[PDB]
Structure 1
Amino acid sequence: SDVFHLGLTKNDLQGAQLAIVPGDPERVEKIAALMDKPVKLASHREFTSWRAELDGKAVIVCSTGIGGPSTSIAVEELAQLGIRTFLRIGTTGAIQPHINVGDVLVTTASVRLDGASLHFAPMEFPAVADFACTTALVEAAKSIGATTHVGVTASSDTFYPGQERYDTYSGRVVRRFKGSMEEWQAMGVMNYEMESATLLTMCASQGLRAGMVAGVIVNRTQQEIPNAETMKQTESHAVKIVVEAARRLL
């Protein structure tokens, strides 16, 4: 009630100025947990949010939920309240043979395959991650023992029919797409997400800092299938990483 969707007043941030924003409310409480004073702040549509304390400081944990459009809202919504640094988080599947399940990727920039990012800046402008927000992550990952990685991620507007795949009802991909996983695999792209380009682009084009840290929970181009526990735990290695990094970014 000062911004919509989120349903939060500027007084609900207790003076905060930074938000960690995953894309799922099941991580919000998990995330907020790893800190102290997590007084659930609200839940209003698909934008479920809390509020915690870190080094005696205000830091929020709000989600996104599939779709750069969906995302574009929460961040702007948030940003107009007080926040001005959107550390993101999440797991994923990489497209490189040398990259393992247990390693964590830190996205420097992204392939703008989404369509949403096109509302804050032309395509010639890059979906670039903030410098400090990138080093802060690498550190936080440089210190727990997580095989760090750094590069570019493809940010496409689709799960099955978009992300270059051929398993569904019909059996195709949009012309200009048909066979895109391969090509990127040759430009040194690491993973396949779906919100980064919007984020990076909508922060980079609007004088706002943001960083990204995922967690390889499976590598499609390899025999060996992942594991429940590995996935369960690994998921948390990514939790700590960012949680721990945000402190320096305050």
Structure 2
Amino acid sequence: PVHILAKKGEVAERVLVVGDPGRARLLSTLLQNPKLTNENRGFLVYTGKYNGETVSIATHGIGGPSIAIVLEELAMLGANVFIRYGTTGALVPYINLGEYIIVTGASYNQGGLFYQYLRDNACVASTPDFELTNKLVTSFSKRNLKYYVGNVFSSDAFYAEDEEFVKKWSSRGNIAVEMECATLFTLSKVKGWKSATVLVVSDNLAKWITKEELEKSVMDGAKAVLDTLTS
């Protein structure tokens, strides 16, 4: 590896990946005896225990290219189970802020990364591991957390303009929008890794919350994700 400078044995098999470095650190406090195993290029990687199991919490930055690089290196260091945990903008009105979304599939625009990996333009099903996603569902319900199940659209251009964004993607079976799921799912399915994703709705593009309520929402969801990784 060349971005994640941790050494083999400092990265657990089970990994909770987040886009923000500040969140990884913040969430590292939910672990027993948290240890910073990397900080190169800003990709903070924490390792510790939870429910008598070794778990890592890594940063993947923003975008397909970035997370693809982080997954590849975490895997080279032993990781083979990934659960992305982030925030997202909902594409449907009936979903409120602070509630969660367990991802079942990712729509995406063809090209770049996908072309380079898939070697052609075929639309390979971009889905998470079935077992692991069901385990996520069981966890969130066990903790009485309000969650919705559906596909998301993984966008590459946050600021690109599209006058029909919400209608287009919502009418295409997508209930929210983020940026890494398509790369995570497809890359996982190719490399043989088990992956899933849970998102915190921080905005509704089709229809508010305090910073406290949100972090509380992020915290509750994290315990559910961490439970699943060690279940």
TM-score w.r.t. length of structure 1 = 0.86
1:236 equivalent to 2:219? Answer yes
Unpaired runs of at least 5, structure 1: 162-172
**Unmatched runs of 5 consecutive residues or more in structure 2:** none
Q: Secondary structure at the match of 1:96?
A: coil
SS at match of 1:89: strand
Measure, in 1, the Cα distance between the counterparts of 2:221 and 2:16. 12
User: Separation in 2 of the partners of 1:90 and 1:123?
Assistant: 28
Cα deviation for residue 99 of structure 1 reads 1.2
- 1:212 is displaced (CA, Å) by 0.2
Moved more, 47-56 or 230-239: 230-239
SS in 2 for 1:128: coil
Of 117-126 and 70-79, deviating more is: 117-126
1:144 aligns with 2:143: yes
1:10-159 counterparts in 2 under 5 A?
10-13=8-11, 16-113=12-109, 115-121=112-118, 122-159=121-158
CA deviation map 1:115-141 (0-9, x unaligned): 423333243211111011101111111
* C-alpha displacement of 1:178: 5.2
Q: Residue by residue, what CA displacement relative to the aligned partner does 1:13-52 show, whole Å, maximum 9, x if unpaired?
A: 3xx3121110111111222211201011120003211111
Q: Which residue number in structure 2 is paired with residue 214 of structure 1?
A: 199
More strand by share: 2
Q: Structure 1 228/81 Cα, relative in aligned 2: closer, same or farther at 3 Å?
A: closer
Q: Give the Cα separation in 1 of the matches to 2:194 and 2:151.
A: 17
2:16–2:82: 8 Å Cα contact kept in structure 1? yes
Could you state the TM-score of these two structures normalised by the residue count of structure 2?
0.92
The alignment covers a number of residue pairs equal to 228
User: Do 2:13 and 2:55's aligned partners in 1 also have CA atoms closer than 8 Å?
Assistant: yes
| Deviation sequence 1:182-236 (CA, Å, 0-9, x none) | 12211331111001100101001221110000111221322xx333332232222
Which segment drifts farther, 61-70 or 28-37? 28-37
Give the superposition deviation at 1:91: 1.5
2:181 aligned residue (187, 196, 200): 196
Question: Post-superposition, which runs of at least 4 consecutive aligned residues in structure 1 deviate over 4 A?
Answer: none
Q: Contact (CA 8 Å) 1:112, 1:123: kept in 2 or not?
A: no
Which structure shows the higher helix fraction?
A: 2
Query: Would the aligned equivalents of 2:166 and 2:206 in 1 still touch at CA under 8 Å?
Result: no
Give the Cα–Cα distance (whole angstroms) in 2 for the partners of residues 156 and 131 of structure 1. Answer: 23
For 2:159, the aligned partner's letter is: Y
Q: Is the 8 A contact 1:102 1:146 kept in 2?
A: no
Which amino acid counterpart does residue 197 of structure 1 have in structure 2?
A
Distance 1:57 1:237 in 2: 19
Task: Tell me which structure has the larger Cα radius of gyration.
Answer: 1
* 1:162-201 pair list within 5 angstroms: 173=161, 179-201=164-186
RMSD: 1.6
Looking at structure 1, the residues matched to 122 and 132 of structure 2 have their Cα atoms a distance apart, in angstroms, of 23
The change in CA–CA distance for 1:117 and 1:237 in structure 2 (over 3 A counts) is: farther
**Amino acid paired to 1:120:** Y
CA contact (8 A) 1:105 1:150 kept: yes
